[model samples]
Target: RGPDKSYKRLQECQRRCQSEQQGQRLQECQQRCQQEYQREKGQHQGETN
Candidate 1:
């Protein structure tokens, strides 16, 4: 229900990752965001709804 938090996180990640000179860094950033949001979306680790 409160996935909105993760939504913004991914958005922010996209911006920050895109700024990276390394595509590897961008993918890494995206994967981290995806993991965080995925876990949050399912249950919890940091923040959960």
Candidate 2:
């Protein structure tokens, strides 16, 4: 998925983790999601250029 969609999904997943009260899971999820976002963002920019 694109970066925007990936980010939206990440936010949803983060909320779910928060609802479950998962501490480490949320942190790990955030880190992974951020990586995905950056990766997709870079790919998108490269493609656009």
Candidate 3:
């Protein structure tokens, strides 16, 4: 996960697709997901140890 990574990617993708709002918004969501993933991954290696 270089930049964009998220545990809820599938949900997010579904949301974006459902929304069909705009390209920019989709990108924004992707970016946010990525950041969240990176942060969480950094904080914890696994959801359950």
Ranked by lDDT, the better of candidates 1 and 3 is 1
Tens digits of lDDT, candidate 1, 1-49: 4658768888787777778635788788888878876766787443534
lDDT of 2 by residue, 1-49 (tens): 4556768877876677677656788788777767776777778657666
Would you estimate the TM-scores of all the predictions?
0.60, 0.48, 0.44
Question: If ranked by TM-score, best first, what sequence of candidates would result?
Answer: 1, 2, 3
Ranking by lDDT: 1, 2, 3
Model 3 residue 14 CA deviation in Å? 6.6
**lDDT, candidate 3, 1-49, per-residue tens:** 4533455664566476547745877777666656765677666666645
What is the alpha-carbon RMSD of candidate 1 to the true structure? 3.6
Poorest lDDT segment (10 consecutive residues) of candidate 2: 1-10
Backbone clash count, each prediction separately: 0, 0, 1
Q: Please state every model's RMSD to the true fold in angstroms.
A: 3.6, 5.0, 6.0
Model 2 RMSD in angstroms: 5.0
Cα deviation at 49, candidate 1, in Å, is 6.7
